[PDB]
Amino acid sequence: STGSATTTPIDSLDDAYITPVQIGTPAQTLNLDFDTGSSDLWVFSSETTASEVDGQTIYTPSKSTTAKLLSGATWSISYGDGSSSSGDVYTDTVSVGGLTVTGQAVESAKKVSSSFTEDSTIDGLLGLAFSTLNTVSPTQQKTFFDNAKASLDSPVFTADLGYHAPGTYNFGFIDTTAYTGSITYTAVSTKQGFWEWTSTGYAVGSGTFKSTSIDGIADTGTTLLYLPATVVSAYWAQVSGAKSSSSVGGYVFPCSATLPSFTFGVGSARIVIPGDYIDFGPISTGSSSCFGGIQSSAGIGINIFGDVALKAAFVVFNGATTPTLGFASK
Ligand SMILES: Cc1cc(NCc2cccnc2)nc(N)n1
Ligand SMILES: Cc1cc(NCc2cccnc2)nc(N)n1
Ligand SMILES: Cc1cc(NCc2cccnc2)nc(N)n1
Ligand SMILES: Cc1cc(NCc2cccnc2)nc(N)n1
Numbered sequence: 001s002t003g004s005a006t007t008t009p010i011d012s013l014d015d016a017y018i019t020p021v022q023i024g025t026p027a028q029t030l031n032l033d034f035d036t037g038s039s040d041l042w043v044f045s046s047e048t049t050a051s052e053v054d055g056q057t058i059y060t061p062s063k064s065t066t067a068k069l070l071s072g073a074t075w076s077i078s079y080g081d082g083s084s085s086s087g088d089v090y091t092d093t094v095s096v097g098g099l100t101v102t103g104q105a106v107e108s109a110k111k112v113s114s115s116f117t118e119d120s121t122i123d124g125l126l127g128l129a130f131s132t133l134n135t136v137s138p139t140q141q142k143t144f145f146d147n148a149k150a151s152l153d154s155p156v157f158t159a160d161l162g163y164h165a166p167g168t169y170n171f172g173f174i175d176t177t178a179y180t181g182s183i184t185y186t187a188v189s190t191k192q193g194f195w196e197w198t199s200t201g202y203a204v205g206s207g208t209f210k211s212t213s214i215d216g217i218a219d220t221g222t223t224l225l226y227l228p229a230t231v232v233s234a235y236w237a238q239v240s241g242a243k244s245s246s247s248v249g250g251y252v253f254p255c256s257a258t259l260p261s262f263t264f265g266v267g268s269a270r271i272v273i274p275g276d277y278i279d280f281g282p283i284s285t286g287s288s289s290c291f292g293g294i295q296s297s298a299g300i301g302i303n304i305f306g307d308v309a310l311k312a313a314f315v316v317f318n319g320a321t322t323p324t325l326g327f328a329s330k
Helices: 114-119 144-151 230-237
Strands: 003-009 016-024 028-035 041-043 067-076 085-096 099-112 125-126 156-160 167-171 185-188 196-204 210-218 225-226 242-243 248-255 262-267 271-272 278-281 287-292 294-296 302-307 316-318 324-327
Touching: 003 085, 028 041, 099 114, 099 144, 125 156, 185 196, 185 271, 196 230, 210 225, 225 248, 230 248, 248 294
Parallel strands: 028 125, 041 099, 210 302, 225 294
Antiparallel strands: 003 016, 003 167, 016 028, 016 085, 041 125, 067 085, 085 099, 156 167, 156 316, 185 324, 196 210, 196 262, 225 302, 242 248, 248 287, 262 271, 278 287, 316 324
16 A cells, blocks of 8 residues: 655745644544654644644544544653643544554643644644654554554655645655655664664865764654754854854844755765755844754754755655665755
């Protein structure tokens, strides 16, 4: 089997992306944030504290003839930024782009932090990291991809995120019309539960390529590109007036600037992020200070190839017995 679903940015600046997912019988369609950096499928629901729901579409398990309580199971997750959610668990039928999994753990939120409440366009998350990170207790649950894997034509999914435009998540096949040239595959470590790999270096604009190993994760769930402070300083040094500011907690550049591209290495291949992709717009309405899309990872503990980087490529998440990642230009 295969599936194919369109993923759509939530606003004009690609702050996050949403993909429609069918849950239950009859289907209840919720727009979920597909997140290769986490491993829980959780939704706003009829159980969510009412004051913490503000415009989201909710899953109501009592209206699904295929829903079943997973007795005794609870979940709780903290993301790196202070965003949190928790609740109980049902199993139900879940379909993405025509690919159906029965008995999928659907984690129903009883509580969500304010950032989730305020994101009216995001009805939940669908995790696509490794199932070892799933937070359900006392019985850890599998991701949608792990449950679908054996049925798929090939044990892969692909992320093709758009710049200021919709893109595609495919399951079970590689669309050879969706990229140019060849896909370069690179080794993955699953030791931390992430799609963790090692970039071979970087270049700033038309500058020379610096060969250096950069370990990081491919995370569709992270909006920005987070890299070592040395690399980030070298990038922003090429933008007149750019600076790291403590009020905004990161690098800002003049909204009159033209940004240089940023290239990252995948083996001997190179992925070029156009300068415009590194532009996230004014820090507040009417400001002439604009938010940079490349930021330091120094406070995180890991480098993160988030959407800024991934949207410049066609990305293969290869879930074979020994997982690998593939990147192609497009
Ligand atoms: C899921 C998610 C991410 C996101 N990232 C961008 C962002 C903007 C401002 C401050 N911090 C982050 N914006 C939203 N709306 N939801
Ligand atoms: C995948 C994901 C979503 C999310 N949503 C909360 C949120 C909303 C707005 C701005 N920043 C965060 N937070 C995180 N860390 N990961
Ligand atoms: C995405 C974005 C928005 C922006 N807004 C500033 C602005 C205000 C008024 C007229 N022209 C520009 N400036 C830049 N560099 N990128
Ligand atoms: C205007 C704005 C602020 C912001 N703040 C959160 C933040 C600070 C430092 C690094 N990463 C995230 N994030 C985004 N995307 N836009």
